[PDB]
């Protein structure tokens, strides 16, 4: 499994 989209969403909320 690889939640790549989850990591992208966390960056758009912080950065």
CA–CA–CA angle 13, 11, 8 (5° rounding): 115
CA distance 3 to 11: 13
Q: How far apart are the C-alpha atoms of 2 and 14, rounded to whole Å?
A: 20
Report CA-CA distances (Å) from 7 to 1, 10, 13: 13, 5, 10
C-alpha span between 15 and 3 (Å, rounded): 18
Q: How far apart are CA 12 and CA 15, in angstroms?
A: 5
Residues in the chain: 15
Tokens 């690889």 -> residue: 2
Lookup result for tokens 């499994």: 1
Cα–Cα distance measured from residue 3 to residue 9, given in angstroms and rounded to the nearest whole number: 10
Torsion over CA: 8, 10, 13, 15 (sign): negative
């Amino acid at each position: 499994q690889a939640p790549a989209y989850k990591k992208a969403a966390k960056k758009l909320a912080e950065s």
